[PDB]
DNA sequence: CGCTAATGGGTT
DNA sequence: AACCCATTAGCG
């Protein structure tokens, strides 16, 4: 049942990282490439981890908007 | 299970 | 390139 393609380990975000990602999201639902890279740098996260966090946060946000 | 990080497969 | 968003899957 295991994938043939290697998947990345699941990142566990710190409370500090989640607090800052949530503050960023409340302010701006979409980030410029520069604002995203800068946030990744400030939090010692990868660009992709921040990009994906934003994407999955927008999914969650759209589901709450629908109720 | 529930939440949500990462990925698939297609769109913008 | 980044997004959309259904899906796959890790873990408390």
Residue numbers in the entry: 227 to 293
Give verbatim lines from the article:
Transcription factors (TFs) recognize specific bases within their DNA-binding motifs, with each base contributing nearly independently to total binding energy. Here we solved high-resolution (<1 Å) structures of MYF5 and BARHL2 bound to DNAs containing sets of dinucleotides that have different affinities to the proteins. The dinucleotides were recognized either enthalpically, by an extensive water network that connects the adjacent bases to the TF, or entropically, by a hydrophobic patch that maintained interfacial water mobility.
Mutations of the second T (T8) of DNATT to G8 decreased affinity less than the mutation to C. Overall, the recognition pattern in the DNATG complex is similar to that observed in the DNATC. Those water molecules connect the side-chain oxygen of Thr278 to both O6 and N7 of one of the observed conformations of G8.
